[PDB]
């Protein structure tokens, strides 16, 4: 039994190491200790001080340099007896305070124990290095074990949800939270791994796992926060039959950050797939697609970074191609996929310049021709569609002649639409393959793009961060609000506790209905024919400045507004919001591509599930309305499941192992509600059954007995 055998890999990598006689002496000491701030300005840097005396309301303790200070007992953060250091579930701590919780995660992390319970949910602190705890033999150990029978692990909460699904006949969800780079995506993959192994009886299982490298190659990119940042969110339904065997899966994908295809900030990359193609293509792929190196392509040569530390793009391309094979994409489908990737790189190299008059011309047609060739479209039709698109003016049909900037933006709009529709097509193709059985039950794993702050935050960052704020609201509603409403509806002598975490004011600012929040005002300005980015920001300032406590009109800029999110204030730059929200694409460009000789390109443009834009009145649904609809669908789905939460925690902002930064971590423990979440578990009454069915508590409700 590896659990009990101190020499096992399980003990070695998932259990706290045996302490020594030196540590035993320290563990039986009668001394008592306190966590204090050497520097009072610096509330998250703590040292340990010995308590040397006390009065009825105070402690005097020594400082590290030896001096002595005094603190009111009411303000004191006591250090737990050290026997608690490394404890597996923090609800067991005698003293529950910020530096003690952090210290416990510190002890575990220092020994590469990244998983720790904090009551009913799991905390996972990213190691930023590989740790051998996800092998088949680890899986085998966890299979079927109750949570208190085994060490903290993502496998354990996965097993717990899987047994609840069987035992209760109820759909489950695993909600993995965290800011960008914290570990959501990696933990999500472990959940799927685990569920596929323990509920497996095996092609379908391979196809479920091989979905991932395809989605990541096209949907992930290096940002300044994560070398493998998810730029789309997803909810993965793992499907089971009444017997509990896996019977299929379905991937709900959420809006992709398609602006990254045409622009990346300094040090960032475009989507991985562009680098994988250029590094891994054969000699004949490269010639047939007219490819060169990333440096030759405007969409890859602007950020100054074309490589990621520790990643071989040609190796990843082999893995993406093998995943495509396993999932079932044909050889011609694959070649079409790569033609669309190459063609986008060619479109980006088109250089418009100013003609005799205001209208643009194309004097060098090399990149236009190369694109047209791989796309299987007519280069004259394409050129005309870029620079002289036809529109209605009243009912008249009028050929425009766009200037360089407008031609360039239309070219960029076409590229983003090609790439976003290709992505949707990939997901649709994958799903039809995994759609093999009607499900009896599902466990849904949610992996959103995590909370993110850049030097410049745009409309995509606001939607990301709102998603994160809603997810945090959901944790709060499940841990605190619904928990206490149950106590109240049952009358068990409970005084309501204000846990002081309420995202509602920030949610209403962003998405409120009356008064209108930011998104409703954005939609308003989006169908107002005279609107500009500047009238938009003036309208936000007029509604919220010095009226809404979560909004700030900054004095240092006329083009930014601040939103105080649960995870910190973010300043958003309003430039391009109206164009991003309307997401226009000239119809003459669609007509050009509907005519493509390529079977995949033709689907992207003729298949209404892919090509069609929904309507509202006589305007295309805006991106904000599409955002809202996706989020409201997710929230509706989660409400039909029993949720389990895993809070991923980033150790620092440099993507380095062995470097836990106190301020970085504590900010997350605070805005995640981790200590509040531990307290509700300690102070409350987690279990309750309609009557039927030594010691003390225990509580009798109007229809249930509740026990702590």
Ligand X SMILES: Cc1ccc2c(c1)C(=O)[C@]1(O)CCN(c3ccccc3)C1=N2
Q: Examine residue 229 and tell whether it contacts ligand ADP (CB under 6 A).
A: yes
Q: Examine residue 152 and tell whether it contacts ligand VO4 (CB under 6 A).
A: no
Burial of 194 (0-12, 13-18, 19+ CB in 10 A): buried
Q: CA 289 → CA 222, 281, 286, 422, 657, distances in Å?
A: 25, 10, 5, 18, 40
Does 179 belong to an annotated binding site?
Answer: yes
* DSSP class per residue in 44-104: T--EEEEEEEE-SSEEEEE-TTS-EEEEEGGG-EEPPPGGGTT-SBGGG-SS--HHHHHHH
Per-residue contact track with ligand ADP, 510 to 549, x per CB under 6 A? ----------------------------------------
Q: Examine residue 102 and tell whether it contacts ligand X (CB under 6 A).
A: no
Asked if 638 and 262 touch (Cβ cutoff 8 Å), the reply is no
Q: Examine residue 468 and tell whether it contacts ligand VO4 (CB under 6 A).
A: no
Comparing CB distances to ligand ADP, the nearer of 183 and 643 is 183
Does a cis peptide bond (omega within 30 degrees of 0) precede residue 228?
A: no
Does 178 belong to an annotated binding site?
Answer: yes
The closest alpha carbon to 699, from 519, 505, 487, belongs to 487
The closest alpha carbon to 340, from 218, 223, 212, 211, belongs to 218
Which among ligand X, ligand ADP, Mg ion, none contacts residue 128 (Cβ within 5 to 8 A by kind)?
ligand ADP
Which among ligand X, ligand ADP, ligand VO4, none contacts residue 186 (Cβ within 5 to 8 A by kind)?
ligand ADP
The closest alpha carbon to 199, from 1, 2, 439, 432, belongs to 439
For residue 261, the 8-state DSSP code is G
Structure tokens at 273: 């797939």
Which among ligand ADP, ligand X, ligand VO4, none contacts residue 627 (Cβ within 5 to 8 A by kind)?
ligand X
Q: Examine residue 681 and tell whether it contacts ligand X (CB under 6 A).
A: no
Q: Cα 534 from chain centroid?
A: 30
- Angle CA 31–34–37, to nearest 5: 145
3-class state of residue 563 by DSSP = strand
Comparing CB distances to ligand ADP, the nearer of 187 and 581 is 187
Handedness of CA 696, 701, 704, 708 (dihedral sign): negative
Per-residue contact track with ligand X, 401 to 420, x per CB under 6 A? --------------------
Q: Examine residue 180 and tell whether it contacts ligand VO4 (CB under 6 A).
A: yes
Does 385 belong to an annotated binding site?
Answer: no
Q: Name the one range near ligand VO4 by CB under 6 A: 160-168, 226-234, 582-590, 614-622.
A: 226-234
Q: From the list 210, 230, 526, 626, which residue makes contact with ligand ADP (rule: CB under 6 A)?
A: 230
Does 420 belong to an annotated binding site?
Answer: no
Q: Examine residue 104 and tell whether it contacts ligand X (CB under 6 A).
A: no
Q: From the list 253, 276, 449, 596, which residue makes contact with ligand VO4 (rule: CB under 6 A)?
A: 449
Does 339 belong to an annotated binding site?
Answer: no
Comparing CB distances to ligand X, the nearer of 256 and 368 is 256
3-class state of residue 169 by DSSP = coil
Per-residue contact track with ligand ADP, 179 to 208, x per CB under 6 A? -xxxxxxx----------------------
3-class state of residue 370 by DSSP = helix
For residue 481, the 8-state DSSP code is I
Residue ranges of the binding site for ATP: 178-185
Q: Summarize as ranges the residues that interact with ligand ADP (CB under 6 A).
A: 126-128, 130-131, 178, 180-186, 226, 228-230, 450, 648
Q: Summarize as ranges the residues that interact with ligand X (CB under 6 A).
A: 232-233, 254-255, 257, 448-449, 460, 463-464, 467, 623, 627, 630-631, 634
Q: Summarize as ranges the residues that interact with ligand VO4 (CB under 6 A).
A: 180-181, 184-185, 225-226, 229-230, 449-450
């Amino acid at each position: 039994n590896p659990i009990h055998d101190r020499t096992s890999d399980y003990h070695k990598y998932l259990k706290v190491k045996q302490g020594d006689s030196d540590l035993f002496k320290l563990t039986v000491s009668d001394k008592r200790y306190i966590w204090y701030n050497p520097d009072p300005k610096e509330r998250d840097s703590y040292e340990c001080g010995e308590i040397v005396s006390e009065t009825s309301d105070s402690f005097t303790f020594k400082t590290v340099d030896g001096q002595d200070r005094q603190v009111k007992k009411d303000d004191a953060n006591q250090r737990n007896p050290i026997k608690f250091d490394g404890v597996e579930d923090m609800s067991e701590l005698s003293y529950l305070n910020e530096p003690a919780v952090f210290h416990n995660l510190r002890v575990r992390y220092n020994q590469d124990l990244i998983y720790t319970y904090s009551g009913l949910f799991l905390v996972a602190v990213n190691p930023f290095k590989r740790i051998p705890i996800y092998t088949q033999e680890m899986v085998d150990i966890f299979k079927g074990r109750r949570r208190n029978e085994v060490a903290p692990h993502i496998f354990a909460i996965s097993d717990v949800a899987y047994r609840s699904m069987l035992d209760d006949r109820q759909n489950q969800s695993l909600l993995i939270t965290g800011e960008s780079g914290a570990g959501k995506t990696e933990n999500t993959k472990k959940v799927i791994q685990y569920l596929a192994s323990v509920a497996g009886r095996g092609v379908l299982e391979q196809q479920i796992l091989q979905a991932n490298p395809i989605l990541e190659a096209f949907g992930n990119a290096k940002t300044t926060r994560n070398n493998n940042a998810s730029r789309f969110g997803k909810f993965i339904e793992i499907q089971f039959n009444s017997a509990g065997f896996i019977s299929g899966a379905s991937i709900q994908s959420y809006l992709l950050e398609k602006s990254r295809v045409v622009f990346q900030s300094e040090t960032e990359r475009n989507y991985h797939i562009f680098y994988q193609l250029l590094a891994g293509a054969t000699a004949e792929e490269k010639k047939a697609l007219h490819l060169a190196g990333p440096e030759s392509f405007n969409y890859l040569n602007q950020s100054g970074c074309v490589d990621i530390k520790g990643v071989s793009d040609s190796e990843e391309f082999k893995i993406t191609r093998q995943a495509m094979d396993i999932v079932g994409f044909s050889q011609e489908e694959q070649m079409s996929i790569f033609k669309i990737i190459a063609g986008i790189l060619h479109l980006g190299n088109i250089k418009f310049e100013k003609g005799a008059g205001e209208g643009a011309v194309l004097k060098d047609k090399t990149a236009l021709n190369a694109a047209s060739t791989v796309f299987g479209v007519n280069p004259s039709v394409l050129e005309k569609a870029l620079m002289e698109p036809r529109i209605l003016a009243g009912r008249d049909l009028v050929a425009q002649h766009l200037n360089v900037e407008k031609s360039s933006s239309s070219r960029d709009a076409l590229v983003k639409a090609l790439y976003g529709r290709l992505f949707l097509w990939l997901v649709k193709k994958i799903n039809n393959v995994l759609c093999q059985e009607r499900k009896a039950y599902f466990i849904g794993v949610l992996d959103i793009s995590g909370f993110e702050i850049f030097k410049v935050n745009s409309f995509e960052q606001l939607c990301i961060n709102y998603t994160n704020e809603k997810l945090q609201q959901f944790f709060n509603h499940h841990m605190f609000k619904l928990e206490q409403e149950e106590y109240l509806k049952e009358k068990i002598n409970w005084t309501f506790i204000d846990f002081g975490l309420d995202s509602q004011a920030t949610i209403d600012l962003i998405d409120g209905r009356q008064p209108p929040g930011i998104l409703a005002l954005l939609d308003e300005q989006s169908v107002f024919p005279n609107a500009t980015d500047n009238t938009l920001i003036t309208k936000l300032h007029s509604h919220f400045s010095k009226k809404n406590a979560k909004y700030e009109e900054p004095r240092f800029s006329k083009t930014e507004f601040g939103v105080t999110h649960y995870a910190g204030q973010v300043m958003y730059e309003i430039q391009d919001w109206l164009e991003k929200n309307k997401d226009p694409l000239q119809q003459d460009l669609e007509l050009c591509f509907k005519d493509s000789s390529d079977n995949v390109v033709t689907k992207l443009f003729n298949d209404p599930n892919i090509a069609s834009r929904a309507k509202k009145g006589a305007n295309f649904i805006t991106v904000a309305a599409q955002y809202k609809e996706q989020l409201a669908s997710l929230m509706a789905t989660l409400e039909t499941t029993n949720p389990h939460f895993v809070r991923c925690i980033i150790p620092n902002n440099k993507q380095l192992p062995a470097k836990l930064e106190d301020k970085v971590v504590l900010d997350q423990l605070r805005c995640n509600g981790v200590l509040e979440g531990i307290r509700i578990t300690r102070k409350g009454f987690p279990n309750r059954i309609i009557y039927a069915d030594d010691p003390e508590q225990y509580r009798f409700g109007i229809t249930k007995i509740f026990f702590r």
